[PDB]
Each structure stands twice: as structure tokens, then as C-alpha cells.
């Protein structure tokens, strides 16, 4: 003790310096992310920036496929993102064997949360700064979007965004939702959801994206897939002919 600048404990202001700084840098990959739910589907659209032309884009991912149905978006630095991915994928696999049943978004969420809170007390071990967005299309509750933060906090969403332009995306989403008074998009076919999502993104970060600048993952009933470059291009093209 007598230390808080070398080890992690409660602050008397009550705002823990290690948790606050972990809230702050995550953005060191130049990412901005969102996930929304459609009536039947859950779509993630995510930025990609390629900083060299000695790099392939197709090994660059921020979505990791946990199981067959479960997706996870990590917003963070990538050595920490992956560390969580390795751990999450085994715990998911272990659960599936033991309990005969595919891991819930919320349960994965909760379990990684409780562990990070454990590492926060620990004076010899640090917490991961990772912000983990767990998504799927469960059939026992529909579409679900559940977000954790490194603290140990997690809560249920209607749709979510992460990155510094969190506020801008938030507003775009709030406006749509107030108008329909619904917490989802009811558009039949996933396709129309992905395109809408893409429009709102273009508004928020205020730039047109390319095939190699987005990476899109969609969750469907009983299966999860990331979408390819050629398909991503179809989306950008089709909205150019609404006006």
C-alpha cells in the first residue's frame, strides 16, 4: 500500500485512474464501430485503415468468430483484442460441450467482465482495456446486442457505437429511433439493414468508404459470417441511385 501509481486500488475521489485511462486509449487502431439489429439479423459495420502496402487487408479483422453463431467485435489495441479472443473462444467451446448449448451473448459478456474486475483488484496483474461487443441472432430471444467495457460493466443496447465519433453516430441512431418509436429496424432482408447502417456511418464520420475501408459482418439465424470485398462494393453502389 501507499502506492496507486504502481498497483491498482480504490480512489477517494472514486474514479479509478487505471479504469479511466483504459476508457481513453483503445482508439490506437484508428477504428470506429457500430452494430445494429434488424428484425431478424444483426449487422456490424466496421472501419479498416491499411497503413502500408506491405500489408494484406484480408488478414486484418476486428471481428473474431467465437463459435458458429456468436460474433465478437473488439475495439482496442490488437494484442489485447486477440488475448481476449483466445480466452473467449475456449470458454465458449468449454460451455458448449458441458451444457449441450451455445453460449449467450450476455453470459460470455458477464464472465469476461467478472474476470476483468478480478484483474482490477490484483496488484500483480493488469486489466485489459478491451471493449467487447457481443452479438448474435439467438433464437431464444431474437437478435441481441450486449456491450462490455473493461471495468466489469455491461448493459444491453438497442444498437451501439464505439470510437471518438460515438456521439455523432449516437445522434443519427437516436433520431431514427424516435421517429419509428422502435428499438430495431424492421426491414425484411439483411441487405437493406446493411445499406442503411452504411448511410448513417457516411453521415457521422462524413466520408465515403471503399470496399477496403469497411469490413462488414452479419449474424443470421444459427450462423455467423463476415462479408467479402466484392459484396461490400455492391452496397456502396446501390445507394448512389436513390437520388
Amino acid at each position: 500500500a501507499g502506492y496507486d501509481r504502481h498497483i491498482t486500488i480504490f480512489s477517494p475521489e472514486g474514479r479509478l485512474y487505471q479504469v479511466e485511462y483504459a476508457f481513453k486509449a483503445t482508439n490506437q487502431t484508428n477504428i470506429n464501430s457500430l452494430a445494429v439489429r434488424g428484425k431478424d439479423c444483426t449487422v456490424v459495420i466496421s472501419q479498416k485503415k491499411v497503413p502500408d502496402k506491405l500489408l494484406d487487408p484480408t488478414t486484418v479483422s476486428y471481428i473474431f468468430c467465437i463459435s458458429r453463431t456468436i460474433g465478437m467485435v473488439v475495439n482496442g489495441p490488437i494484442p489485447d483484442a486477440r488475448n481476449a479472443a483466445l480466452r473467449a473462444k475456449a470458454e465458449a467451446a468449454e460451455f458448449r460441450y458441458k451444457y449441450g448449448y451455445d453460449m449467450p451473448c450476455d453470459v460470455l459478456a458477464k464472465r469476461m467482465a467478472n474476470l476483468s474486475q478480478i484483474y482490477t483488484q490484483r496488484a500483480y496483474m493488469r486489466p485489459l482495456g478491451v471493449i467487447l461487443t457481443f452479438v448474435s441472432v439467438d433464437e431464444e430471444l431474437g437478435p441481441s446486442i450486449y456491450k462490455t467495457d473493461p471495468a466489469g460493466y455491461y448493459v444491453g443496447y438497442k444498437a451501439t457505437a464505439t470510437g471518438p465519433k460515438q456521439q455523432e453516430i449516437t445522434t443519427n441512431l437516436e433520431n431514427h429511433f424516435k421517429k419509428s418509436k422502435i428499438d430495431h429496424i424492421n426491414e425484411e432482408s439483411w441487405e437493406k439493414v446493411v445499406e442503411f447502417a452504411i448511410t448513417h456511418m457516411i453521415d457521422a464520420l462524413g466520408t465515403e468508404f471503399s470496399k477496403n475501408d469497411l469490413e462488414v459482418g452479419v449474424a443470421t439465424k444459427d450462423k455467423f459470417f463476415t462479408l467479402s470485398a466484392e459484396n461490400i462494393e455492391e452496397r456502396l453502389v446501390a445507394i448512389a441511385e436513390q437520388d
Binding site: R15, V19, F23, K24, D149, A151, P164, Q167
Partner: protein, 85 residues
């Protein structure tokens, strides 16, 4: 400030510029909870400007909201609250 005190301040700054029929005061009172008159004045003045630049005579419920969101935006941080996390 309490709900009845707040209502006057929104009314008063709005008196001096144009007003809408489509406006509702009722929203403005919920959206600011217990925020000093210095702060409330601040939003309303900003909003009255933002509208004129947007080429509008009347000050709609949407113009008011965007001005509130601009002025409260100072979080470059991802995630907020450590008060209970």
C-alpha cells in the same frame, strides 16, 4: 433549479427572437435537469444562432436538440461514468 423555475428562462430568451407553433416547451424542461440559469441560457442562445445559419425563420424542436448535443459534447473518451461504472 426546479421545473417551474426552468420554464421561464426558456420562454424569456425565446421571446426576443421568432417562435414556432410547432415548438413544445414541455420537452425543453425534461431535457435539462437542474442545470443553472447560466447553463440554460447558454444552450438557447447557441440554438437561436444555429437556426439562422441553417436558413430558418422559426426555431423548431430539432434545432434546439442539436445545439444541446454540440455544447455538451466534450467527451473524446469512449465510455463515460466511473461513478458506478
Amino acid at each position: 433549479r426546479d421545473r417551474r423555475e426552468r420554464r421561464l428562462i426558456f420562454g424569456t430568451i425565446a421571446s426576443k427572437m421568432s417562435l414556432a407553433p410547432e415548438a413544445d416547451l414541455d420537452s425543453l424542461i425534461i431535457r435539462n435537469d437542474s442545470l443553472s440559469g447560466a447553463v440554460i441560457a447558454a444552450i438557447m442562445q447557441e440554438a437561436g444562432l444555429r437556426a439562422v445559419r441553417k436558413n430558418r425563420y422559426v426555431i423548431l424542436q430539432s434545432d434546439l436538440e442539436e445545439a444541446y448535443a454540440t455544447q455538451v459534447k466534450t467527451d473524446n473518451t469512449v465510455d463515460k461514468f466511473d461513478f458506478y461504472k
